[PDB]
Amino acid sequence: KFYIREPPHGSPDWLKVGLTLGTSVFLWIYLIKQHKEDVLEYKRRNGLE
């Protein structure tokens, strides 16, 4: 212990850390799925594949 008073950010807010990581992962997987669906729909509509 160094600080006379406990710092507000003494230990990581694990709830916030988990929410942040989960939100990032969810957004990334959603973006990947959305891109795949967009490519498939574009190819189907243009009659390419």
Ligand X SMILES: CCCCCCCCCCCCCCCCCC(=O)OC[C@H](COP(=O)(O)OCCN)OC(=O)CCCCCCCCCCCCCCCCC
19 touches which of other proteins, ligand X, none (CB within 5 to 8 A by kind)? Answer: ligand X
Is residue 24 a contact residue for other proteins (CB under 8 A)? no
In the complex, which residues of this chain contact ligand X (CB under 6 A)? Answer: 16, 19-20, 23
Alpha-carbon distances of 34 from 4, 7, 47, rounded to whole Å: 51, 42, 20
- Determine the Cα–Cα distance for residues 30 and 24; give it in Å rounded to an integer: 10
* Segment lying near other proteins (by CB under 8 A), choices 5-13, 23-31, 32-40, 41-49: 5-13
Give the interface with other proteins as residue ranges (CB under 8 A): 2-5, 7-12, 17
